[PDB]
Write a protein that binds this ligand. Structure first.
Ligand SMILES: [K+]
Ligand SMILES: [K+]
Length: 154
């Protein structure tokens, strides 16, 4: 995509000009989908950071150069959601649902997911850091007016 919003105005009265830009990665469509996808992956036992999700976006674009960043993110979201649904329909546990996600993504994607998965399990310090960045980013979104409400069965 263009990747950057812009508003530009040239003042005919005093000759000044102002250029206002902001990346599309901070728009609600991108942000809310990223919050959703991190919640989705945690449901099947994978705690990731935003920056690691951005990394999955880049690798996906390398597998499919025609895909935009938004396109790759939505495909990851949909693939994760359809993995959630099929796991709920088959009565699988979190590990089986995670295996289905690995077999639904390209080889380079799955190897990066398994690396991060192993890292969260073997490195307790970095896992706590991942959770720390997750709550920090949520608090930063709440400072911007975001409301993130969780309510389930359990
Ligand atoms: K890339
Ligand atoms: K799937």
């Amino acid at each position: 995509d263009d990747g950057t919003r812009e508003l530009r105005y040239k003042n005919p009265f005093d000759g000044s000009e102002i250029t206002i830009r902001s990346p599309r990665s901070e728009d609600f469509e991108r942000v809310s989908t990223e919050v959703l996808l991190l919640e989705l992956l945690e449901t099947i036992g994978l705690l990731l950071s935003r920056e690691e999700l951005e990394e999955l976006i880049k690798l996906l674009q390398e597998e499919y150069p025609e895909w935009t960043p938004d396109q790759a993110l939505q495909w990851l979201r949909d693939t994760t959601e359809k993995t959630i649904k099929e796991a709920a329909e088959q009565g699988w546990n979190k590990e089986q649902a995670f295996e289905l996600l690995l077999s639904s993504v390209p080889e380079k994607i799955a190897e990066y997911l398994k690396k991060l998965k192993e890292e969260r399990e073997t490195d307790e310090e970095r896992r706590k850091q991942t959770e720390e960045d997750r709550e920090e980013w949520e608090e930063e979104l709440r400072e911007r007016g975001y409301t993130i409400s969780r309510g389930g069965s359990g």
